[PDB]
Design a binder for this molecule. Structure first.
Ligand SMILES: COC1=C(OC)C(=O)C(C/C=C(/C)CC/C=C(/C)CC/C=C(/C)CC/C=C(\C)CC/C=C(\C)CC/C=C(\C)CC/C=C(/C)CC/C=C(/C)CC/C=C(/C)CCC=C(C)C)=C(C)C1=O
Ligand SMILES: CCCCCCCCCCCCCCCCC[C@@H](O)O[C@H](CO[C@H](O)CCCCCCCCCCCCCCC)COP(=O)(O)OCC[N+](C)(C)C
Ligand SMILES: NC(=O)C1=CN([C@@H]2O[C@H](COP(=O)(O)OP(=O)(O)OC[C@H]3O[C@@H](n4cnc5c(N)ncnc54)[C@H](OP(=O)(O)O)[C@@H]3O)[C@@H](O)[C@H]2O)C=CC1
Ligand SMILES: CCCCCCCCCCC1=C(C)C(=O)C(OC)=C(OC)C1=O
Ligand code: SF4
Ligand code: SF4
Ligand code: SF4
Ligand SMILES: [Zn+2]
Lengths: 115, 63, 54, 96, 342, 144, 176, 208, 156
């Protein structure tokens, strides 16, 4: 039984429903974010980034963890809609200044000691 | 009323830790050894969790 | 300050004269004093209102 | 006791001087290198050795409470003088 | 490799890259981006400056403590060059003017100064030299600016045989004189174009692309004695390019043909300014000159760089030129221009 | 009592060494008060006191016009005050370094220097420790 | 035990009513405020003529750091590293080794003046009065790097300010 | 004892013990423990379900009248199965007294919001959610309060690094403030201060 | 040369005008600002030097960063710095603004305002005394006096 108290959803299906509503809200919001913040990206880039951030957590199987992720995503959306975030806060999702760190063994061996 | 989750605990997606510092880290769990310079044993009572040692380099301006 | 060299540092003249004073100065300025385990909430009437520390 | 390195750089009392091929020398171009000229080792070597007539002497660095913690130095060896571990003053029993 | 010059760290602000670079002309358009890219990864940067120190302040946050060092230099003095290149293993030359003054002509800034820098760096022991030329540099070129570029690159190659020569083509960016120039041409009502800009082809290149190419050429071991051409991914007619510029800035486009001699006279008229001229005869010459095609030279793709199309980066330059009514218009709204790609 | 303050003004004019001295002190220190001279520096600063002024205005320094290497007719700053007159001037003591001179030491700077920031004499930090790891030097002879 | 600040009733007689009406119509309290400002106008200002006049300080004042010497010229510091241990901001960095004469001395003694909080804990923790906070406070720089003090800079500060530092310590040491 | 030792107050100790017994008797369903410290402070350890009732009882009851919420905070103890310790501090002006109410939770179990009992809790609860990641159910407006916009993680957790994971600087290429992985020119120097000799025999633990 | 003399005199005039009228923005973050408030107090009277606080960044000349700069605040500081018209100067006051100070190793503190804006003068202290800040402003005045913009333009 494990006797755990829920946050919002009884099982994974209502969690998936809440995920879909949050995705709908973000997808609707993206063009307004592009217009208001005066971003150089296109609406396609923003919606692809929203999809990427959603798929970053696609492996979660605990409804409580999914509920907390939806709560945090709703917090982020409320921050974005009210222009509490600035252009820098939105653009931090794209890592435009960090150089691309290689993945293969040889390049890591050449560069330094990190695994 | 309870929901009876049946999956092992996993909070990696909620701690805000970057990916590199989850899958590439190795933590050691151990009772620290007594400092051989002293006879007191009060520091050998608890368990410690520590991370693997990464690179340290000399700063060019000050050393 | 309280006349307890395990909590308050001794005078500089005593630290430069007595072995116990030097040892206690060394340990109070390197490690500090151990505080017995426990939790307190202490409040005062600061000029802006009740100021407290847990 | 300053000394100049073969590149023209002053060698500090810690013996630190940049190598002739070290790029960090560029930090001193159009500027200077801060070097303290009063080398403490020479200044403490300049002091005379005090003759005292006891096997154990006491040293507190002078100035009473304004010096260092008071220590006691043994003077039984005639091969070497007794050196204070704090201030570096030397003491000895009269010989010869 | 001189242990103090061994790379260390993660490649960030507090790391050591092993690069000590003296960047001549770092207080200009390309120089600030080059200095920023060097200071991102923890390089030691030497900035020779002739201007007022107030004009160098924007370069200060670009590096960690002690990693950016400002020294005065004189182009006509070799001792200054020697002083600023003594302890460097990389020297980059970005000295240039798009007009001539009473103390420096095109020969002074594109032949004599690069030759002095190259010779002093060679005799001082500098291992790597990067020299910047123009894609359209030509000894027979009508413009003096490209003739001087060709002579100077020949002289630099003579003085520093192992140098790397990079030939970009009309860099565009936030502080450029390419998109801002055409955008500012709106203040005269109509846009004067020689032959309506119908027999001119341009291949502009992004500023970040050129800076990353220079950084990679510094870090590339095979790029020692090569010559590179930095161009964009698309070729445009001048008419279509200016029309697209005015469309992105949401300004009324009124192009008209102006004969070559009349435009040269206008440039000569504008040359009389004691301050920075709005245009010159040389500028008029270079604007209407077609960008050369040099397929025998390595490009940005040979240095691991994918050239950024203008249609992605033009808004960040031209949104400043819009009125209040059109400030918030999105990037994908202005229908990219037609491209003559071979 | 108006004539009294007018006479005090004329006395301040006459006590600065004429009209030229009055103008020099007006345009150098924005003040024309007259006080009893306490002492002079080896650099040229003159120190005056006036116990009838309130705490803060009862001690002051007229700076020299020529310090170590620079012309200080207009460019003066508080860092030019030597440590002994620094202690006197900031009211950390009631005794001038004339009546109570400091203790002489062989290591004490015989010449005070002001703030040297922005000059070729500025302090540049550097690491004062020796190289930690020594590299192996390969032999200079061939191996076959 | 308490008091009220705003619990007084105005009298309702004709005299008080007329006084309040005249106050309303002729603005007497506003004239009182004007009179207070006018009184302040003719007072002597509290301004001092900086930099020619300086604000008062104390022998306990904590300013720029310095490293001291014994009267023989030998360094007082013995690399015990108590100041480094006590520093609340970790502004002190120390490395030591035996000297060529076997003495216990530092090879690196750096203070990050942009990390320092100028609390004086280091000179309390020092057992030999080696590191002090001097009386100097006018040492603004033009670059960040100039505020990273190494051992040479601190020894120069000590050699430069020793005359004032010793007098301040002589004035204060019986309270410590 | 004498001069250097803090004196005791037996009257207050007895009064606090009696009132703790009173509260424990009145609410056996939720109260798990009652304690009175040597410096006369009363603590009541309750079950998480009783947050709203117990607090309500301590606010509205005639004999308690703990009408002021002085402080509400969390304490993180990683070695416990229930990681987070939620602490309420209450002041009663009528009886000139203070009380502490302590409960527990983990990373995934919500706690009931107390804004219906004390309005002052609102921001406090937000801070807990900001600083430790504890979710409060039925909070009228729950969101970050102290950290920067978009900040990931909860910094007051013991396993959160002191300097965090990202740092900020102005980048001129993008003409804006950017965030990058942290690098420190001087690493924070860890000190090992604990003595290997025991200090307080009164708190010695069984050797297991 | 007549032209060199003319540009030198004009440089002198403009430098005198710019350093004799320095208007810092009404901008403070932490305890250091309190000491800044003591520099405008009657004892030091910064207004007697020509130094007047102005709230609008468009009407100000100097940024005095008096207090800790957090990560949440850095974009606002950069924004109100960018909105200062030129010529503009920045004075970093106190340990927190200089290098982070007491909170250098925090997760939410910028380790020195010079990571965000260029800095002309660093005023050490925690906090610097009002007199030390006044010394910093006078040193900035001297630095402005050392400017040679028109001479550099003439020698181009
Ligand atoms: C990007 O670089 C550039 C600059 O730098 C920022 C400039 O300022 C600049 C010149 C600045 C313009 C705005 C000048 C505008 C003034 C016009 C010439 C006004 C038109 C003529 C007037 C006299 C109005 C009267 C009309 C006729 C009767 C004559 C140019 C062209 C430029 O390209
Ligand atoms: C007519 C309308 C058009 C023109 C509008 C402007 C009019 C001209 C402006 C009036 C000029 C007067 C300013 C001169 C004041 C200088 C005072 C003195 O202090 O300057 C000293 C030296 O002077 C400066 O170096 C140069 C200033 C003099 C300017 C050169 C004269 C050029 C005049 C040309 C006018 C032409 C106008 C445009 C014509 C088209 C430096 O001292 P400083 O360090 O500060 O003070 C330290 C503070 N202490 C004293 C308390 C210790
Ligand atoms: N801009 C473009 O579209 C592309 C330019 N590249 C080449 O790349 C080089 C740099 O480009 P860019 O930054 O845009 O040009 P800029 O005019 O913007 O900057 C030129 C730099 O060189 C310095 N400089 C110029 N003249 C002198 C001189 N007589 N003495 C000393 N220093 C001088 C300037 O210093 P200061 O500020 O003091 O004047 C400045 O730092 C140039 O040689 C240019 O020809 C070639 C293809 C096109
Ligand atoms: C004009 C009279 C002096 C005003 C000085 C303006 C200083 C502006 C700093 C902003 C600020 C204000 C207003 C302020 O009131 C305050 O106290 C809470 C601060 O924290 C120290 C501040 O930083
Ligand atoms: S004054 Fe305080 S913060 Fe500064 S070095 Fe000394 S102990 Fe450290
Ligand atoms: S300055 Fe004093 S406390 Fe610090 S290492 Fe030296 S002797 Fe020890
Ligand atoms: S430097 Fe010190 S006084 Fe100034 S803001 Fe920071 S903590 Fe406060
Ligand atoms: Zn001794």
């Amino acid at each position: 039984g494990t006797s755990v108290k829920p946050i919002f959803s009884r099982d994974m299906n209502e969690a998936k429903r809440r995920v879909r509503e949050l995705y709908r809200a973000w997808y609707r919001e993206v063009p307004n974010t592009v217009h208001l913040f005066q971003l150089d990206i296109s609406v396609k880039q923003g919606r692809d980034k929203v999809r990427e951030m959603f798929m970053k957590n696609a492996h979660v199987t605990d409804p409580r963890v999914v509920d907390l992720l939806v709560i945090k995503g709703k917090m982020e959306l409320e921050e974005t809609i009210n222009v509490w975030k600035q252009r820098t806060h939105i653009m931090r999702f794209f890592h435009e200044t960090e150089a691309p760190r290689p993945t293969d063994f040889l390049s890591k061996f050449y560069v330094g000691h990190d695994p | 009323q309870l929901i009876a989750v049946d999956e092992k605990l996993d909070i990696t997606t909620l701690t805000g830790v970057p990916e590199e510092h989850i899958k590439t880290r190795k933590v050691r769990i151990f009772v620290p050894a007594r400092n051989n310079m002293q006879s007191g044993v009060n520091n050998t009572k608890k368990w410690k969790m520590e991370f693997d040692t990464r690179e340290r380099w000399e700063n060019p301006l000050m050393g | 300050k309280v006349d307890d060299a395990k909590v308050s540092p001794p005078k500089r003249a005593e630290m430069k004269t007595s072995m116990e004073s030097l040892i206690h100065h060394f340990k109070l300025y390197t490690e500090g004093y151990q505080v017995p385990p426990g939790a307190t909430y202490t409040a005062i009437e600061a000029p802006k209102g009740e100021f407290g520390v847990y | 006791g300053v000394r100049t390195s073969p590149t023209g750089e002053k060698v500090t009392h810690t013996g630190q001087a940049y190598d002739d091929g070290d790029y960090r020398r560029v930090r001193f171009s159009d500027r200077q290198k801060e070097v303290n000229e009063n080398f403490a080792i020479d200044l403490i070597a300049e002091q005379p050795v005090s003759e005292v007539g006891s096997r154990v002497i006491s040293c507190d660095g002078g100035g009473g409470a304004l010096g260092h913690p008071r220590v006691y130095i043994n003077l039984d060896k005639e091969t070497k003088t007794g050196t204070c571990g704090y201030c570096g003053l030397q003491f000895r029993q009269p010989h010869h | 490799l001189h242990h103090a010059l061994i790379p260390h760290g993660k490649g960030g602000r507090s790391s050591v890259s092993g690069i000590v670079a003296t960047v001549f002309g770092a207080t200009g358009f390309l120089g600030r981006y080059v200095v920023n890219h060097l200071g991102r990864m923890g390089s030691q940067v030497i900035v020779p400056y002739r201007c007022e120190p107030y004009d160098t302040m924007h370069l200060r946050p670009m590096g960690d403590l002690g990693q950016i060092i400002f020294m005065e230099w004189n182009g006509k003095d070799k001792d200054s060059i020697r002083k600023v290149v003594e302890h460097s293993n990389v020297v980059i030359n970005l000295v240039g003017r798009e007009w001539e003054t009473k103390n420096f002509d095109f020969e002074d800034v594109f032949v004599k100064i690069p030759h002095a820098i190259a010779q002093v760096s060679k005799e001082a022991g500098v291992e790597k030299l990067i020299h910047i030329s123009h894609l359209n540099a030509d000894i027979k070129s009508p413009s003096r600016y490209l003739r001087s570029k060709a002579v100077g690159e020949k002289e630099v190659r003579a003085a520093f045989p192992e140098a790397t020569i990079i030939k970009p083509s009309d860099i565009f960016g936030r502080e450029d004189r390419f998109l801002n120039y055409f955008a500012s041409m709106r203040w005269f009502g109509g846009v004067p174009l020689i032959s309506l800009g119908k027999e001119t082809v341009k291949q502009p290149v992004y500023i970040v692309d050129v800076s990353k190419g220079i950084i990679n050429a510094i870090k590339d071991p095979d790029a020692k004695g090569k010559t590179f051409a930095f161009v964009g991914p698309n070729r445009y007619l001048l008419f279509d390019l200016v029309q697209y510029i005015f469309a992105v800035a949401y300004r009324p486009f009124l192009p008209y043909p102006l004969p070559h001699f009349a435009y040269r006279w206008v440039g000569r008229l504008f040359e009389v300014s004691p301050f920075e001229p709005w245009t010159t005869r040389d500028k008029v010459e270079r604007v209407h000159m077609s960008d050369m095609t040099l397929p025998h030279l390595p490009g940005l793709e040979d240095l691991g760089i994918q050239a950024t199309p203008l249609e992605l980066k033009a808004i960040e330059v031209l949104r400043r030129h819009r009125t209040y009514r059109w400030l918030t218009s999105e990037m994908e709204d202005v229908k990219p221009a037609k491209t003559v790609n071979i | 009592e108006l004539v009294q303050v007018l006479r005090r003004g004329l006395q301040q004019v006459s006590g600065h060494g004429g009209l030229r001295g009055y103008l020099r002190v007006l345009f150098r220190a924005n003040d024309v008060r007259v006080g009893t001279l306490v002492g002079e520096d080896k650099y040229g600063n003159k120190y005056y006191e006036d116990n009838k002024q309130f705490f803060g205005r009862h001690r002051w320094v007229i700076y020299t016009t020529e310090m170590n290497g620079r012309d200080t007719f207009w460019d003066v700053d508080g860092s030019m005050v030597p440590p002994e007159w620094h202690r006197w001037l900031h009211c950390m003591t009631d005794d001038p370094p004339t009546t109570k001179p400091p203790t002489a030491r062989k290591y004490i700077w015989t010449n005070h220097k002001f703030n040297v920031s922005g000059t070729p004499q500025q302090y540049v930090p550097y690491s004062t420790t020796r190289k930690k790891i020594q590299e192996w030097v390969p032999p200079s002879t061939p191996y076959k | 035990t308490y008091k009220f600040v705003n619990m007084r009733e105005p009298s309702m007689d004709m005299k008080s009513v007329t006084d309040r009406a005249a106050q309303t119509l002729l603005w007497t309290e506003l004239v009182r405020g004007l009179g207070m400002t006018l009184s302040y106008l003719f007072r002597e200002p509290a301004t001092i003529n900086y930099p020619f006049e300086k604000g008062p300080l104390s022998p306990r004042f904590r300013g720029e750091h310095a490293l001291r010497r014994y009267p023989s010229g030998e360094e007082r510091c013995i690399a015990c590293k108590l100041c480094e241990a006590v520093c609340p901001a970790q502004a002190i960095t120390i490395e030591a080794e035996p000297r060529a004469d076997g003495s216990r001395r530092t090879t690196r003694y750096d203070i990050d003046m942009t990390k320092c909080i100028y609390c004086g804990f280091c000179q309390e923790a020092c057992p030999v009065d080696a590191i002090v906070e001097g009386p100097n406070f006018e040492f603004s720089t033009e670059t960040h790097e100039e505020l990273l003090y190494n051992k040479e800079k601190l020894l120069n500060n000590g050699d430069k300010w020793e005359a004032e530092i010793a007098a301040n310590i002589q004035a204060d040491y019986l309270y410590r | 004892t004498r001069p250097t030792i803090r004196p005791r107050n037996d009257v207050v100790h007895k009064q606090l013990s009696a009132f703790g017994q009173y509260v424990a008797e009145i609410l056996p369903k939720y109260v798990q423990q009652v304690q009175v410290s040597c410096f006369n402070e009363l603590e009541i350890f309750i079950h998480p379900d009783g947050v709203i009732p117990v607090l309500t009882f301590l606010r509205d009851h005639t004999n308690a009248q703990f009408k002021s919420l002085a402080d509400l905070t969390a304490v993180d103890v990683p070695t416990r199965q229930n990681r987070f310790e939620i602490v309420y501090n209450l002041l009663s002006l009528r009886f000139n007294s203070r009380i502490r109410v302590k409960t527990y939770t983990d990373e995934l179990t919500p706690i009931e919001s107390s804004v219906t009992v004390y309005k002052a809790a609102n921001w406090y609860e937000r801070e807990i959610w900001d600083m430790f990641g504890v979710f409060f159910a039925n909070h009228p407006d729950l969101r970050r309060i102290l950290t920067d916009y978009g900040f990931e993680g909860h910094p007051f957790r013991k396993d959160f690094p002191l300097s965090g994971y990202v740092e900020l600087r102005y980048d001129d290429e993008v003409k804006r403030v950017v965030a990058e992985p942290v690098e420190l020119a001087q690493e924070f120097r860890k000190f090992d201060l604990n003595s290997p000799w025991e200090a307080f025999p009164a708190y010695r633990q069984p050797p297991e | 040369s007549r032209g060199e003399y003319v540009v030198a005199k004009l440089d002198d005039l403009v430098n005198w005008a710019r350093r004799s009228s320095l208007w810092p923005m009404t901008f403070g973050l932490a305890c250091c600002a309190v000491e800044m408030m003591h520099m405008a107090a009657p004892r030091y009277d910064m207004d007697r030097f020509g130094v007047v606080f102005r709230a609008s960044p468009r009407q100000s000349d100097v940024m005095i960063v008096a207090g800790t700069l957090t990560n949440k605040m850095a974009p606002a500081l950069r924004k109100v710095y960018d909105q200062m018209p030129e010529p503009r100067y920045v004075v970093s006051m106190g340990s927190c603004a200089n290098g982070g100070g007491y909170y250098h190793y925090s997760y939410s503190v910028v380790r020195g305002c010079d990571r965000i804006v260029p800095v002309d003068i660093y005023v050490p202290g925690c906090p610097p005394t009002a007199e030390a800040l006044l010394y910093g402003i006078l040193q900035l005045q001297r630095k402005i006096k050392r400017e040679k913009r028109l001479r550099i333009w003439y020698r181009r």
